[PDB]
Amino acid sequence: GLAVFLPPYPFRGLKAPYLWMFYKYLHCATDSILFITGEDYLSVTDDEAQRARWEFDPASMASLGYELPNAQSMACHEYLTLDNAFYETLLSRHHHDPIKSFSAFLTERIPDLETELHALLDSKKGIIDQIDTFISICNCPSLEHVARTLGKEVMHIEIGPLRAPMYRNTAYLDFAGVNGGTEASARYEKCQAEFDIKASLGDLHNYFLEVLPPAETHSAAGVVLQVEDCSNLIAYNHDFTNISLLSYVRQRYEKEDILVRAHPGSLFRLRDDVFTIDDSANSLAFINQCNEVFTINSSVGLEAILTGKKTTVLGDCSYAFINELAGASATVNAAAFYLFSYLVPFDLVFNQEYLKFRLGHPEEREIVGKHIEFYSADMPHSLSSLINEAISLEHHH
Amino acid sequence: GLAVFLPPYPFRGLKAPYLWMFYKYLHCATDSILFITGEDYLSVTDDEAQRARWEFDPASMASLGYELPNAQSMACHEYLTLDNAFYETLLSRHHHDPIKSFSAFLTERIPDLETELHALLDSKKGIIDQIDTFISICNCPSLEHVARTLGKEVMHIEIGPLRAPMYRNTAYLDFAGVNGGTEASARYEKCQAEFDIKASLGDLHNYFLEVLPPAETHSAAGVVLQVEDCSNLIAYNHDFTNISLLSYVRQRYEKEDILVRAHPGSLFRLRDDVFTIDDSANSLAFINQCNEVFTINSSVGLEAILTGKKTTVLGDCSYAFINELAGASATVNAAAFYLFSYLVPFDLVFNQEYLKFRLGHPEEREIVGKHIEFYSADMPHSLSSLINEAISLEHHH
Ligand SMILES: Nc1ccn([C@@H]2O[C@H](COP(=O)(O)O)[C@@H](O)[C@H]2O)c(=O)n1
Ligand SMILES: Nc1ccn([C@@H]2O[C@H](COP(=O)(O)O)[C@@H](O)[C@H]2O)c(=O)n1
Ligand SMILES: [Cl-]
Ligand SMILES: [Cl-]
Ligand code: NA
Ligand code: NA
Questions:
Q1: Scanning A194, B150, B176, B213, which has its CA 20 to 30 A from the CA of A159?
Q2: SS3 B269
Q3: Which atom in ligand 2 lies closest to the alpha carbon of residue B167?
Q4: Cβ contact (<8 Å) for A266 and B270?
C-alpha cells in the first residue's frame, strides 16, 4: 500500500496545510492507505470554525476532482499522527522563526523527527512490510533518511505547473525531489536521442491548453511574483525574493518598461503608483503582453518558455533545463519530454495502479504511452511517433 | 572638514539613493565639505527626467529643512566620484543579486572598493589631512577599514526613529554603527547611575510629540511591517522578513486578533481579506489600538515602548536594550538616556560646530546639555536635573 506523508506543522500559520491532498487521496482510494499526518487533518472537517477554507469550496473541489470524505471513506485507512510538542521544540531551535524552521524541514535532516517517524511506523506490527512506497508533497530529508533505512522509495508528488481551468491538470512525480533537487533534466539527458518531435513549442502549449487563448500594447519586461512563503521561495530560490527579483529587473529596465504581476495567492499586492501593475485575468494574458519574462521559479516561467518568450529563471525548478538549451529543435524535444513524460496527468498520481506502475521504474516510452492514453481518453508506435500522433489528433479535432 | 560618504550604487534600482542627505549637508554647510559620492548625485538635479522624485517635493524639503542647491552652493565643496564599473563587477560576484550585493556592502569589507576609496582620497594633495571625520549614512566596513588605516573616525548618521510631523525631528549619530552594531546600549551602561528621571515613559513620549495626540476597539496583537529592502531588513533582521514576522505572530494569535500595518513607504500593501488591515493616519494611532506590538526593527517599536505597550523586537536595533530591562524605573532611565543623549536633534548632525563637539567625545552630561539647549531654543544643573527640568518646562508650557 501507499504511505502518504502530509505533515501537520503550521509553519505558515495555517493548520493542516496540505489538506487538499489528504482529501484527494481519500476520494481516489481504491485500497487502504497509510496516512502519516497530524490530528489537525482529522479534526478540521467537523471543526466548523475552519469551514471557510478554500479546500471546502465546491469550485475548488471540482477543479481538483474530489469530494469531502465521510466516516465511511476514512474508516478504510490507517492513520499515524505526529505530535505538536516536536513542532514547538523545532521552533525553539531556529530562533522561533517558523519560516526558517520550514526551511530546515525541507532541506535538512531532523533526527528527533526521524525518531518519531520510526516509532510511528513501528507502532503496529506489519505496517512497514505493507508499505510499497512513501509519498511526500515536499522534500523532507528526515523522511527520506527513514526511507533509506527501511528500504522504501519516496515519490515526491505535488500539483504541477499547468493547472485547470487554463490547462489540463498536471502533477509532479519525482523520486529525488519536487521543485528542488528534481530529476527531470537527468531523465531527459538519458532519453534525449529518442525525441524527434515535429511540433513547435506553441503546439506543445496548445495541446495542454483547455481554453480558447486570450485575445492578443507590449511591455519590454514582465516580472512574475510568487507566494512569499511557498517552499520554493524559501528553499530553492537561490536567495532571491520578490523584492530582489524586482531590483534585478530594475538594473536592466526603467520602470516605465516593467510590468509586474503579483501572485493571486500571495497575501501582498503591489502599490498602484510605482510600477505598471498587471491586471490580466490569467498569467497567459499577462505574459503575452511581455517581450521578455523574469521569474525566480514560478510555474509561469514554463508558460513563458512554451509561448516562445525570452525567459530568465533565477531559482531552481523542474523546467529550468529546457531554457538552458541552445537549439530550437533541442528546446522542443526537451519540452516534449518534460510535458509528456516528466509531468503526470494529475489524477494518475492519486491512482494506486499507476503508482505501482511507476514504482517499477519503466522505460520512458511506457511512461509517455500511459500518459497519452489518459490524455487521449475522450478522443474519437515509438516514443516520438506516439507524441507526434497525439499532437496531430489534437491538430484536427 | 567633513568627509561625507554617500554611495551611488543603485542596489534597489534608484539612482542617487541618499540624495536627501546630499542636499541637507549642502544646505546647512557653513564650511567646505568633501563629498565621496557618485556622478548621479551631481547630474540628477538638471536631469529633468527624475524631477518627480520626493527629494524635490517642497513638502518633503520643508519637513527635512533644506532647499535645492544652486551652482553657487555646490561650488564651495570638493567632490570625489566612484565609478559604476565596480558596481557591475560587485553584482557579478554575488550572483547578480543587487540585494545580496547591498548586504555585502553593509556587512563585509570589499577590497576593490577600499582601493578606489584610497585612490580618490589620494587624488589631490592635502585632502586626507584636512579630513576631521568621515560621515556615512550606513555601515560600510570598506570605508571603516580605510578610515582605520588613515586614523579617521566614522560617524554613522541617519534620520532617527522620531520624525516630523508627529515628533521633533531626530537623527542618529553613532561611531560604531547605525541601526546595526550600535553603541547606544554600551553608552547607557556606562552612565546609567547618573539617570534618575522623575517622569513616566509617556511623559518622555509627550516631550517629543509635536501634535495633539490622536483620539483613543482594541486588537490583541499589532504587527508592524517595514520596507522590504531597507538596510535593516537586509542586514540587521536576524533573518526575519515581513512574511516570517506575520507567521511568527500567527503562531501566537488567530487572525481575528491580529492587526497589520503596512509601511507607507513599502512597495507592497496587504490583500484586503485575510487579516484586519490597519488604515490609521499614522503609526501612533495604530499602536494605540493594539494590546501588544510585534516588530523586526521598525522605528515604530520605539513608539510602542514609549506608550507602554508590550513590544516584541525580533531584529537588531538601537532601542532594543530599553525593552530588555525589567524595572519600570530602569526602563524610564534608559529611555531618557536614549532620547536625550543617544538621539540627536536632527539639524545638529548637519551642523559642523556640533560635529566637531562630538568628535571630542565629551561626557554624557555635555551631550544632553547641548541637545536640551536646542530643544529648548523657543522656550520662554546635573544630567538628571537638566532632563527633569526640561520635562517640567514642557509640563506647564
Ligand atoms: N505572478 C503570478 C504567479 C502565478 N500565477 C498563477 O498561479 C499558478 C502557479 O504559479 P506558481 O508556480 O507561481 O505558484 C500559475 O499557473 C498561474 O496560473 C499567476 O497568475 N501570476
Ligand atoms: N508599519 C509602519 C512602519 C513605519 N511607519 C512610519 O515610518 C516611520 C519609520 O519607520 P521604519 O523605521 O519602520 O522605517 C515611523 O516613524 C512611522 O511614522 C508606519 O507608519 N507604519
Ligand atoms: Cl486531460
Ligand atoms: Cl525641536
Ligand atoms: Na488543447
Ligand atoms: Na511635545
A1: A194
A2: strand
A3: 16
A4: no
